[PDB]
From a paper:
The spike (S) protein on the surface of SARS-CoV-2 exploits angiotensin-converting enzyme 2 (ACE2) as cellular receptor and mediates the fusion of the viral and the host cell membrane during infection. S1 consists of the N-terminal domain (NTD), the RBD, subdomain 1 and 2 (SD1 and SD2).
We first solved the structure of the S protein alone that was purified in different batches and exhibited two conformations: the locked conformation and the active conformation, with overall resolutions of 2.7 Å and 3.3 Å, respectively. We did not observe the previously reported closed conformation, in which all RBD domains stay in “down” position but pack looser than that in the locked conformation. The contact area between RBD and NTD of the S protein is reduced from the “down” RBD in locked conformation (locked-down) to the “down” RBD in active conformation (active-down) and to the “up” RBD in the active conformation (active-up). The S protein undergoes a clockwise twist from the locked conformation to the active conformation when looked from the S protein to the viral membrane, which loosens the NTD and SD1 domain by increasing the distance between the individual domain and the central axis.
Numbering used by the authors:
A (entry chain C): 298 to 395
B (entry chain C): 544 to 618, 633 to 676, 690 to 741
C (entry chain A): 692 to 941, 944 to 1037
D (entry chain C): 939 to 941, 944 to 1135
E (entry chain B): 939 to 941, 944 to 987
Write the structure that this text describes.
């Protein structure tokens, strides 16, 4: 460590500070709430009548697992863009006030 | 709940209001969390802690070293245990043999303790302040010199350093 | 609340004439104190632990700024060894540990409040003990174990908050008992040998005759001392008693300001970890989760730049303060050689 | 000629190391895609190469700033050292100093300057007493109900006879009325002796 | 009364020059589109 922080192969007599004592993690744990249902993917994206844009509709979503892969067979979106989050991270997260 | 991290989880005494899930310290790092299944509060403490120093007699003489863990008290969070474990008010020193003598400081460990490459091995000792002396003081005794010596000593003092200039655009 | 013009001092007039003189007929022996800072706290910083923590992505991104951390630590180690050099120039002037004999016959002068107390664990004087309790440090020892602050004890104890972020305080080379031994040797030499132990070998001399030499040095004949010896001894003893009194009563502000400044600097470093520096958050774990590598790197870069400049500011101000303490320690060494080892 | 001037070599070493550190710090990206301006300016067009060049400019400017600041601090220290050297030149070389340990250990006699690379060396010639000897002493001498004090010396006794000598060199002499002066009678001085 | 106190005038000169340099350094873009906050805040929206 000292040879490498000195950028030399020779060390001269003395005492040198090295990095703090590190401990490596042994396990990995995940703790999500107890949720069983799936989110209403089929009554939001597969509804029969949508609202007019001047009187748009707002729906509350809560207490459901957001496994969007079920939309892969029956849906094809021409525009999909998220702001404030990455699309590749959506499967690890947990969402508030949806 | 999506918040990732690393550390040690322990049972807590903090008590959250029902609308709270995370707890933050002054540096704004998350240091407490409510478990989403058991609804119990946990403290999150970092994992790395404690300074480390390495004492070498120079790698042009030997690759023996001693290691000072400045935050350990052995009577462990160490890389190795070997032999010659010696406790100091500066930390736990591993790899150097403790002796009872006292010399001038060679490599200062700290808190009054020095180390040196003697007999080869590495030894650690308490530094000596100097030779002890006593003056034969009485209320009617004086000491007068009878000879002298003419002494010549050197004293070195820096007076200048190198004058440099820099071209910003070229750098 | 009142506002006024400050006064410069009491007005006085000298009765000057072309054939008038004023001659003193008595004297007073005065004892005064002078306080001088000699060292400050030696600190060290782990860049990786301060800037990144246990983040591996941040630590890999930081490898473009390793020269800057080697530079910071070089500066801090320079300061750290300079502090020990300071203490050595001030206190280690003589390398013979003189003891004072059990012959406490010093012509009537009482040196009991400034001479070592063998009834203590240390061998500190009475006055040194009174001084030791008027300066409150921040580190009672230098071994704070990991298990000792594990839980919420961290971030409620400022020292564990500093330690979990890579900020270490190293212990001085000379313990307080060694410094007390040095001052004890200086006192013993100066009261049993006068000013001769600073120029060669200590040559004993009775204390009253040494005091007569010192009276000669200021332009007063020796018979003035020898004929007023009891009065002079009593005045000296009373003045020393006045010192202890005043102290034990009520300060060492110039020595407490150093401790306060170092502690405040470290704590300011710790609180500056709550700045966004123009990023979306100040926590690496909120960025690394909810953002993917290539577009989290911009935020992590902002944080890295901010925290690096924070460390740089700290090191610069520490260098400036160390220069000032160096000047003070040089003055103290000069005063030790010229006022204690001689007569000025 | 045997075997050093470490305090004068440290200055050279520090300045050289500072300049070389400046040179190696040109290999930092500072958060850009590369540390070479020619890899950015080729493969990238002006408006979107300007962001990278801005990152590099900021980094290198702060590198220069750090260098200049540390140079100023070091120059202050060298200024203090040079002021001390000028004081020593005027007070130890151009005169004789009474300040203890200012111009060497002992009693200062004289000093000689020698020039060295980026510095000065002083050779301090001092006087060190040696071969001391024990004597009995007294503050005053009582002769005719009068107390006699030495003029510029100290009263010593070889065991049987009393002499007056100078304080820094043993040179005993007979106590006369030209060595001493009278003040008062023999009732106030503490350790007065008869002679 | 004839003809100086250069060492005392250099202090005044240095302090004045430092303050004036601070004032002129308000004309730097630092890599932005302009050095005026009112040209940025007008023609550009918050985020
Ligand atoms: C979440 O589910 C777990 C089980 O999957 C529940 O844990 C039970 O808790 C009760 C306490 O009232 C225990 O008696 C059971 O033994 C637990 N079950 C298991 C398998 O450990 C938990 O209660 C659920 N969450 C909530 C809020 O009810
Ligand atoms: C939305 O409507 C479509 C069409 O009615 C449903 O899609 C069918 O899904 C099943 C299971 O994946 C397939 O076997 C069928 O082939 C699909 N239909 C067609 C016409 O191919 C879809 O399930 C509905 N969404 C919801 C949420 O119910
Ligand atoms: C004072 O000390 C000097 C030594 O510094 C003595 O001179 C030495 O005497 C010895 C023995 O006679 C010789 O071997 C040396 O050559 C002498 N030294 C020099 C430099 O000449 C001197 O005798 C001492 N004087 C007294 C009175 O003791
Ligand atoms: C020395 O003699 C002078 C001359 O009388 C004294 O000083 C004057 O004292 C009066 C009253 O205190 C003042 O009003 C005058 O202004 C003083 N100065 C003069 C008259 O020039 C002084 O008190 C004497 N000093 C001592 C020690 O006795
Ligand atoms: C010189 O001053 C001292 C005081 O410092 C005088 O001694 C004091 O005398 C008074 C009255 O006799 C006593 O109450 C005090 O106790 C004495 N002080 C001490 C410390 O002993 C002394 O008399 C003065 N001398 C002359 C010639 O005026
Ligand atoms: C103290 O010194 C005196 C010198 O004055 C010694 O006395 C003389 O010694 C010499 C030689 O022994 C004799 O010739 C003289 O007759 C002595 N007397 C005088 C008056 O000169 C004396 O011996 C010394 N004492 C000691 C203890 O050394
Ligand atoms: C195992 C050990 O070291 N115990 C000591 C104890 O004997 C001593 O009295 C105390 C003083 O503070 O320090 C601790
Ligand atoms: C007696 C006295 O006061 N001082 C010393 C004494 O301690 C020492 O043992 C002796 C031998 O060197 O010389 C004298
Ligand atoms: C006054 C003080 O501080 N210490 C002591 C005191 O306790 C003691 O009674 C006296 C006589 O022995 O000597 C002194
Ligand atoms: C010759 C002479 O002066 N003798 C005196 C003596 O009379 C007196 O009793 C003694 C105590 O003061 O001091 C002596
Ligand atoms: C250390 O090694 C170098 C090269 O091998 C050599 O020149 C040098 O003299 C060695 N050190 C000592 C103290 O001999
Ligand atoms: C080590 O622990 C002992 C007792 O547990 C304690 O006395 C000592 O102070 C500790 N180490 C140091 C040098 O502080
Ligand atoms: C070293 O000092 C200790 C202190 O108790 C003593 O017990 C021992 O005999 C001495 N010699 C050794 C152990 O080398
Ligand atoms: C010196 O003064 C102290 C008071 O602090 C007293 O205890 C002691 O007895 C005095 N010494 C002598 C020899 O009177
Ligand atoms: C002075 O006398 C004392 C008392 O015996 C002794 O310790 C010491 O050696 C003597 N000093 C010299 C220089 O003879
Ligand atoms: C010196 O002390 C002795 C005690 O041995 C005493 O008899 C004598 O009177 C004292 N003399 C002086 C001048 O203090
Ligand atoms: C000194 O001489 C006087 C007068 O001759 C005498 O009274 C006194 O006692 C003597 N002192 C001693 C100590 O003999």
């Amino acid at each position: 460590e000292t040879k490498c922080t000195l950028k030399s192969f020779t060390v001269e007599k003395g005492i040198y500070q090295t990095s703090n004592f590190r401990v490596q993690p042994t396990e990995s744990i995940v703790r999500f709430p107890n949720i069983t249902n799936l989110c209403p993917f089929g009554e939001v994206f597969n509804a029969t009548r949508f609202a007019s844009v001047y009187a748009w509709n707002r729906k509350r979503i809560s207490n459901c697992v957001a496994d969007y892969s079920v939309l892969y067979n029956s849906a094809s979106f021409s525009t999909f863009k998220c702001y404030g989050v990455s699309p590749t991270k959506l499967n690890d997260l947990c969402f508030t006030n949806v | 709940n999506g918040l990732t991290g690393t550390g040690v989880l322990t049972e807590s005494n903090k008590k959250f209001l029902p609308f709270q899930q995370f707890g933050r310290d002054i540096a704004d790092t998350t240091d407490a969390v409510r478990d989403p299944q058991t609804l119990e509060i946990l403290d999150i403490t970092p994992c790395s802690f404690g300074g480390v120093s390495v004492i070498t007699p120079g790698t042009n003489t030997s690759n023996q070293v001693a290691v000072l863990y400045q935050d350990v008290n052995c009577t462990w969070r160490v890389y190795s245990t070997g032999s010659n474990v010696f406790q100091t008010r500066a930390g736990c020193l591993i790899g150097a043999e403790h002796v009872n003598n006292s010399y001038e400081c060679d490599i200062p460990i700290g808190a009054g303790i020095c180390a040196s490459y003697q007999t080869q091995s590495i030894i650690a000792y308490t530094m000596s302040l100097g030779a002890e002396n006593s003056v034969a003081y009485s209320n009617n005794s004086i000491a007068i010199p009878t000879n002298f010596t003419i002494s010549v000593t050197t004293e070195i003092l820096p007076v200048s350093m190198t004058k440099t200039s820099v071209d910003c655009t070229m750098y | 609340i009142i506002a006024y013009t400050m006064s410069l001092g009491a007005e006085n007039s000298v009765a000057y004439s072309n054939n008038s003189i004023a001659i003193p007929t008595n004297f007073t022996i005065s004892v005064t104190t002078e306080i001088l800072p000699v060292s400050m706290t030696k600190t060290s910083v782990d860049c990786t632990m301060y800037i990144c923590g246990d983040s591996t992505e941040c630590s890999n991104l930081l490898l473009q700024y390793g020269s800057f951390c080697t530079q910071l630590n070089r500066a801090l180690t320079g300061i750290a060894v300079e502090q020990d050099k300071n203490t050595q120039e001030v206190f280690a002037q003589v390398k013979q540990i003189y003891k004072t004999p059990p012959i406490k016959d010093f012509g009537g002068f009482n040196f009991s409040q400034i001479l070592p107390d063998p009834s203590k664990p240390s061998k500190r004087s009475f006055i040194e003990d009174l001084l030791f309790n008027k300066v409150t440090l921040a580190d009672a020892g230098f071994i704070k174990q990991y298990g000792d602050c594990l839980g919420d004890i961290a971030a409620r104890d400022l020292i564990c908050a500093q330690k979990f972020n890579g900020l270490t305080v190293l212990p001085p080379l000379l313990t307080d008992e060694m410094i007390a031994q040095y001052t004890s040797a200086l006192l013993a030499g100066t009261i049993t040998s006068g000013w001769t132990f600073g120029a060669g070998a200590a040559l004993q001399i009775p204390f009253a005759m040494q005091m007569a030499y010192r009276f000669n040095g200021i332009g007063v004949t020796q018979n003035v001392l020898y004929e007023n010896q009891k009065l002079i001894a009593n005045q000296f003893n009373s003045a020393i008693g006045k010192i202890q009194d005043s102290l034990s009563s009520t300060a060492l502000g110039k020595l407490q300001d150093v401790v306060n400044q170092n502690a405040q600097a470290l704590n300011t470093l710790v609180k500056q970890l709550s700045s966004n520096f123009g990023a979306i958050s100040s926590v690496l774990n909120d960025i690394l989760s909810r953002l993917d590598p290539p577009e989290a790197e911009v935020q992590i870069d902002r944080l890295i730049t901010g925290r690096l400049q924070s460390l740089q500011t700290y090191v610069t101000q520490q260098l400036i303060r160390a220069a000032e303490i160096r000047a003070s320690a040089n003055l103290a060494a000069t005063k030790m050689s010229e006022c204690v080892l001689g007569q000025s | 000629s045997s075997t050093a001037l470490g305090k004068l070599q440290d200055v050279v070493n520090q300045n050289a190391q500072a300049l070389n550190t400046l040179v190696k710090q040109l290999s930092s990206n500072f958060g850009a895609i590369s540390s070479v301006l020619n890899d950015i300016l080729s493969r990238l067009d002006p408006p979107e190469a300007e962001v990278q060049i801005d990152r590099l400019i900021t980094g290198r400017l702060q590198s220069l700033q750090t260098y200049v600041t540390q140079q100023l601090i070091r120059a202050a220290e060298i200024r203090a050292s040079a002021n001390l050297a000028a004081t020593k030149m005027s007070e130890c070389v151009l005169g004789q100093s009474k300040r203890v340990d200012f111009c060497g250990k002992g009693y200062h006699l004289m000093s000689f300057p020698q020039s060295a690379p980026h510095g000065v060396v002083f050779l301090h010639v001092t006087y060190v007493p040696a071969q001391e000897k024990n004597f009995t002493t007294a503050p005053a001498i009582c002769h005719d109900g009068k107390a006699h004090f030495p003029r510029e010396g100290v009263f010593v006794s070889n065991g049987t006879h009393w002499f007056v000598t100078q304080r820094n060199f043993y040179e005993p002499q007979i106590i006369t009325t030209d060595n001493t002066f009278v003040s008062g009678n023999c009732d106030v001085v503490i350790g007065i002796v008869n002679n």
